[PDB]
């Protein structure tokens with residue numbers, strides 16, 4: 586069974602996918618959400634922060650103590666609170682907050698501090714030996730949502746573009762593009778034809794079937 590480590594009260598939990606990849610899950614307002622923790626030889630890298638600065642601080646502190654290294658970088662996958670709500674903490678700690686330009690533009694528009702706006706449609710990053718690819722597949726859950734791919738593990742972080750099995754509808758679609766969303770999913774499936782695991786933005790880890798589930802929800 587996968588190792589699962591929790592904070593006091595269960596508001597933050599980390600679950601191990603492999604030697605260097607963990608999923609981090611927090612309970613916001615109850616609404617759980619997921620991101621990743623990458624344990625690299627040059628520091629810890631997160632995919633996404635959390636709902637607010639209190640949770641982001643506690644996540645950072647938990648992983649820095651456990652893995653005995655600093656969080657250096659975070660990839661922000663869209664400009665909603667579940668993903669970006671800890672940006673003030675990141676900036677004041679000197680943690681690099683990577684994003685697309687559009688995500689940064691939307692964060693500013695909505696009153697958050699701005700991530701770097703450095704990610705392109707395809708960006709390849711390397712942290713120690715850990716390779717990370719970011720990909721903008723098109724509009725879907727939001728205008729700006731990106732996915733993150735770990736090519737050494739064929740793990741896809743779908744983020745909120747990808748719904749878990751337990752999601753029975755599309756959720757909050759105020760900022761969504763429900764026509765383009767199917768094409769954007771298809772763009773992910775075309776880019777990454779052999780996928781080991783898919784981490785949705787909310788709910789249980791699954792596999793490619795979560796992408797097919799999302800397509801069905803969009804009918």
Ligand SMILES: O=C(O)/C(S)=C/c1ccccc1Cc1ccc2ccccc2c1
Nearest residue numbers: 616665666667745755756757759786787
């Ligand atoms: O669906 C999403 O991924 C997002 S980030 C939606 C969203 C849309 C706009 C503003 C805030 C949110 C967060 C949210 C709000 C209510 C939720 C209920 C159930 C499950 C997840 C939920 C997430």
Ligand SMILES: [Zn+2]
Nearest residue numbers: 663665726745
């Ligand atoms: Zn969202």
Ligand SMILES: [Zn+2]
Nearest residue numbers: 667745786787
């Ligand atoms: Zn979300």
